[PDB]
């Protein structure tokens, strides 16, 4: 065929996929075959989770990561997040799984039977890495596809049932979004917020109106940018600051996926809006705040005056002030006073936690929720023993948030290493010394000594 | 010539696994040490010496299996199979911890045989014996930790047991009782180990990124010939790079590789000296000036006083189960505890 | 040329005794700021309330510390993850009481170290060499990110970040073991194999090259003078070194390709430290080491203790004593 050998390509077997940089036909089959593997896992994992799913117990007690994504879109759940129909979970799994066979068929064909190069078959699908016009056009096409995808989430929230809203009155329910936030001061205000405590950058979005409004903006921006890059070519300043090669383009996207991986880690760790705690379990801050409220209710029922109860250090045993004065929970959970949750906000007034509402308005469902989230804190061992590292074997539990946070931090880190590796090599190969130093022309030998 | 030169010829024949005179000591001792550990971690318990399970047969996994030390009542007994304790009974010999001394003693002589193997091969090949000299560091560590340290204590019981989790307990024991992290001889060992790993990474990365282009392919490994006279990487470019990045750099390739020997070997020798001190409870546990001030001033607090509180919690909560022969009965009211926890 | 082009030539110049570069334009001011603040704080900073319970911990030399016990103390737990620059405090006295210097130092340091890694690529490009030295440095850099930034984020407070001191580091290691059982975590075990193995191979490669040096000097002079800086010929016999080590074990267990050997010396400790950096980073989200507490029981149901149960008794002792005044509720959830 072509290459498939060290002497014919220059790369060894352990770097054999690099023999496809100039073979556009087989490279297309690789991306399409790998795309089939992604859809396969999505379909297969969903069917696995459904077969092992028990509706009488919460999702976060069953090690589910994909079903909570479907429930958040408003399928199969009713008020309070309780599952009422498992058939939409089955449909998503089957359609993704069946679609992987189509992508698998095309990936095997384009990589084994199809032409190894597309430049001689059709001038539209053929491409060269140096062609700055064709590259931007392919980028513009995929930008449009990404734009329509973000609008699919908007159409679902506004025209096809809506989304699950953990902030809806009554303990959460599926709600249709009729007034998306279009104000740019609110949408782009998130991008300018600090990533530190009490601000949280875009991770702090706490209402569906801002979520669906942002995807309207992103949808239009991608489609507008897609049209832009199809009709234009990179300017002079852009074509002098970038390396234009296949490996260089890969390195740019590796940095991007790494960046997105770190952001997703914090999203699943802190955000309880697009990751409802009814499905994924409580967050770290949430469970720590729930413990303070649990024993607040406990001791107050026994007659304790939680407002005037001085603690051992001099700070309040139950209630204290934040650095800016807000009445917050006491103890080590003072660090988590930025937490906001539907079971806690009814107790907040203008100055923070309202002592009168604490002494009169605590409901049984709030005591219930706090006890549930306190005893489901996202702490567990590698062999899925729930609780602190000193707990005995008994509870088989590790929060899905811990699984989703740890896994994507590992992947994000290695993709950052991937960026560094492939970006450094792209510079060296483009300059012509990625294979070593020329003995007859060593640059340092032609430089003046440092001293 | 006699049978000695005949045997010498056969022992030094070039075979797939070189034997030599040192093999007469190395191979049986290394095999019995290795086979003793695998036999114990598979079938042998620690129930009568420690009150612990420690074999696959009892339900332990790879992390929890161990060949545990003999009971404290055995003192420093050699625990010979034919000795007065086991009296030739193989079963009782296992139940009393005889495999620990079996592994430690045969292992000690196996290390001697291996170092002699380094001497014997170096002489026949004709090179300098610096590899044998470097192996003195693991020997000093083994001898100090597994032999000198328990010999200074009450019995073999307080030596490290041959196991993954058991070695971890050994680490935590030295923090709560010896404050071993505070010992400057361990700190010098840490710098030698961490410094050694730094030198290893930075030297291999420097060579692999200063290579000469001696081949045409993208795989640079093929562009090398073990019989070539020229260097395979540029010392001049490597010196220029590190002189501008870090300020200083190597300029002598022979000093560089000797330094790679010196750092890890010296580090291990320093920590071996510290362990010899701990054999006699000669610890660097406290700073007297800190204790006098903290005793009179209840507002003086440092990370040093915070760590001693942790060591005190380790000792009280661990000792009853870790030293069962002492019959430590600590009532709940006497255990040191912070608020709530 | 104009003023801008002449400035660009000086920044990227290969004739400067110390290379600057564009990464150096950020690295130099941030590292100087972190260094200057660290020296002043380590010597003269007043005690700071690390745990947010009005219990200041003395860290500086002038307040009764020595080299071993001194530290720059992490910022207050009442601050959490909030950004606490100088201009956000009512006064420098408030800033000093709450651990302000800690944030200034770690933030300027982590940024200057990030540009230090990028500076390693930049000079490698200006000199025409291969660029992957910075990849090897990413392993210690990722480790510093874990203990200074990643672990505070997962726990919600810079008060649980590693202190800037010798004894403070030991306090970080002990509390980490009680709350995560890091010894029983495979990533730390892989990190131990990375640092143990790295030190082994360092002494190994050093001894084998030293053993096979070609005789070029006299017995009354150092053998290092047998190598001249810049000489073309190699200074040792790798075939003799291969012949010795190949017989110490067996033939196929020894390297004869120097490029393959030196790549192995780089891969082993770097990959091992990547794992141990990821260990701290994943344990920041409470995915802890193996828990085998009470895993072995007898026919009746009595617990049969293992060495893991003994480790747990030690962990309990660290747990109930750490921050003895900061907990009001039974579970230490963060």
């Amino acid at each position: 065929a072509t290459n498939r050998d060290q002497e014919s390509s220059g790369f060894a077997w352990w770097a054999g996929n690099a023999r496809l940089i100039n073979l556009s036909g087989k490279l297309l089959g690789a991306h399409v075959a790998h795309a089939g593997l992604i859809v396969f896992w999505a379909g297969a994992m969903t069917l696995f989770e459904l077969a092992h799913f028990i509706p009488e117990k919460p999702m976060y007690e069953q090690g589910l990561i994909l079903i909570p994504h479907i429930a958040t879109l408003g399928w199969g759940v009713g008020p309070g997040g309780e599952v009422v129909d498992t058939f939409p979970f089955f449909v998503v799994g089957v359609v993704h799984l069946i679609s992987s066979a189509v992508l698998g068929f095309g990936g095997v064909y384009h990589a084994i039977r199809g032409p190894e190069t597309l430049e001689e078959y059709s001038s539209f699908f053929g491409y060269d890495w140096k062609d700055k016009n064709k590259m931007t056009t392919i980028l513009g096409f995929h930008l449009i596809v990404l734009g329509i995808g973000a609008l699919l989430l908007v159409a679902k929230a506004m025209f096809f049932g809506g989304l699950y809203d953990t902030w809806a009155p009554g303990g959460g329910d599926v709600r249709v979004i009729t007034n998306p936030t279009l104000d740019p001061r609110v949408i782009f205000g998130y991008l300018l917020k600090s990533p530190f405590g009490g601000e949280g950058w875009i991770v702090s979005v706490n209402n569906l109106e801002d979520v669906v409004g942002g995807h309207i903006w992103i949808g239009l921006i991608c489609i507008a940018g897609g049209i832009w890059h199809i009709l234009t070519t990179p300017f002079g300043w852009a074509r002098r600051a970038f390396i234009w090669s296949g490996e260089a383009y890969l390195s740019y996207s590796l940095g991007a996926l790494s960046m997105m991986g770190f952001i997703a880690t914090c999203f699943v760790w802190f955000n309880n809006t697009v990751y409802p705690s009814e499905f994924y379990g409580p967050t770290g801050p949430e469970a720590s705040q729930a413990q303070a409220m649990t024993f607040l209710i406990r001791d107050q029922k026994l007659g304790a005056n939680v407002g005037s109860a001085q603690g051992p250090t001099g700070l309040g045993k139950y209630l204290m002030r934040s650095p800016t004065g807000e009445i917050i929970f006491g103890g080590e959970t003072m660090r988590f006073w930025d937490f906001r949750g539907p079971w806690l906000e009814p107790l907040r007034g203008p100055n923070g936690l309202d002592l009168n509402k604490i002494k009169n308005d605590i409901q049984p469902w709030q005591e219930r929720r706090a006890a549930e989230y306190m005893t489901h804190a996202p702490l567990g061992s590698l062999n899925s023993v729930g609780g602190v590292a000193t707990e005995i074997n008994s509870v088989n539990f590790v929060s899905p948030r811990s699984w989703l946070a740890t896994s994507h931090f590992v992947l994000a880190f290695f993709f950052l290493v991937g960026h560094l590796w492939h970006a450094g090599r792209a510079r060296a190969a483009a300059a012509g010394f990625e294979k070593g130093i020329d003995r007859e022309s060593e640059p340092v030998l032609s430089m003046p000594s440092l001293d | 010539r006699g049978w000695f030169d005949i045997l010498d010829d056969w022992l030094k024949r070039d075979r797939f696994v070189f034997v030599g005179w040192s093999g007469i000591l190395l191979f049986p001792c290394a095999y019995l040490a290795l086979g003793g550990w695998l036999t114990g971690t598979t079938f042998v318990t620690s129930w009568y010496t420690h009150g612990l399970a420690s074999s696959y047969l009892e339900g332990c996994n790879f992390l929890t299996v161990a060949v545990s030390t003999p009971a404290n009542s055995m003192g420093h007994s050699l625990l010979l199979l034919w000795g007065p304790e086991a009296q030739g009974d193989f079963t009782r010999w296992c139940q009393l911890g005889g495999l620990w001394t079996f592994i430690a003693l045969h292992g000690a002589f196996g290390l001697i045989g291996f170092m002699l193997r380094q001497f014997e091969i170096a002489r026949l090949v004709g090179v300098r014996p610096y590899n044998a000299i470097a192996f003195s560091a693991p020997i000093a560590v083994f001898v100090s930790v597994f032999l000198i340290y328990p010999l200074g204590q009450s019995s073999w019981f307080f030596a490290p047991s041959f196991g993954v989790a058991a070695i971890f307990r050994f680490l935590l024991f030295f923090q709560g009782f010896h404050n071993w992290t505070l010992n400057p001889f361990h700190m010098m060992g840490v710098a030698g180990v961490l410094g050694g790993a730094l030198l290893c990474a930075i030297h291999g990365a420097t060579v692999e990124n200063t290579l000469f282009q001696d081949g045409e392919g993208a795989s640079t490994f093929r562009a090398f010939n073990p019989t070539q006279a020229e260097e395979t990487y540029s010392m001049v470019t490597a010196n220029r790079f590190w002189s501008q990045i870090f300020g200083i750099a190597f300029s002598n390739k022979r000093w560089l590789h000797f330094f790679m020997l010196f750092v890890p070997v010296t580090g291990l020798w320093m920590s071996a000296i510290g362990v010899v001190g701990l054999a006699l409870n000669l610890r660097s546990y406290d700073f007297i000036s800190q204790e006098i001030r903290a005793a009179e001033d209840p507002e003086f607090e440092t990370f040093y006083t915070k760590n001693l509180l942790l060591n005190e919690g380790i000792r009280a909560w661990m000792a009853p189960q870790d030293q069962p022969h002492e019959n430590f009965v600590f009532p709940e009211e006497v255990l040191p505890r912070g608020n709530a926890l | 040329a104009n003023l801008w082009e002449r400035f660009c030539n000086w920044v990227t110049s290969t004739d400067n005794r110390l290379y600057v570069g564009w990464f150096g334009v950020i690295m130099i001011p941030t590292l100087l700021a972190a260094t200057i603040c660290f020296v002043i704080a380590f010597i003269a900073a007043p005690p700071v309330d690390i745990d947010g319970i009005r219990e200041p911990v003395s860290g500086s030399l002038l307040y009764g510390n020595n080299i071993i016990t001194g530290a720059v103390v992490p910022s207050s737990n009442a601050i959490g993850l909030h950004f606490y620059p100088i201009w956000e405090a009512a006064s420098l006295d408030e800033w000093l009481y709450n651990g302000g210097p800690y944030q200034l130092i770690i933030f300027h340091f982590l940024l200057g170290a990030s540009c230090y890694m990028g500076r390693q690529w930049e000079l490698s490009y200006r000199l025409g060499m291969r660029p992957w030295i910075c990849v090897a440095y990413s392993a210690p850099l990722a480790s510093a990110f874990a203990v200074f930034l990643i672990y505070p984020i997962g726990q919600g407070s810079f008060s649980d970040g590693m202190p800037l001191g010798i004894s403070g580091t030991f306090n970080f290691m002990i509390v980490f073991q009680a709350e995560h059982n890091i010894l029983m975590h495979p990533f730390h075990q892989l990190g131990v194999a990375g640092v143990f193995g790295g030190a082994l191979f360092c002494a190994m490669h050093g001894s084998l090259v030293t053993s096979s040096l070609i005789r070029e000097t006299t017995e009354t002079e150092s053998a290092n003078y047998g190598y001249k800086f810049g000489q073309e010929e190699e200074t040792y016999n790798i075939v003799a070194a291969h012949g010795y080590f190949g017989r110490l074990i067996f033939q196929y267990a020894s390297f004869n390709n120097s490029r393959s050997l030196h790549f192995f010396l780089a891969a082993w400790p770097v990959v091992g430290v990547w794992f141990t950096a990821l260990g701290i980073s994943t344990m920041a989200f409470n995915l802890n080491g193996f828990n085998f507490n009470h895993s072995v029981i007898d026919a009746k149901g009595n617990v049969i203790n293992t060495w893991a149960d003994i480790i747990n008794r030690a962990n309990l002792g660290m747990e109930v004593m750490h921050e003895r005044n900061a907990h009001n509720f039974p579970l230490d959830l963060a």
């Binding site: 000594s449 | 300020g247 300029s251 | 030399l61 800086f229």
Partner: peptide, 30 residues
């Protein structure tokens, strides 16, 4: 007394860094 000793040793190390870099033995290619 102790503080002055600790700082004095540290300052000498910083001065040694200056000479070891800017006043080193210049590497010469024979």
């Amino acid at each position: 007394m102790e503080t002055i000793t600790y700082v004095f040793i540290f300052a000498c190390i910083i001065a040694l860094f200056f000479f070891a870099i800017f006043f080193r033995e210049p590497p010469r290619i024979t």
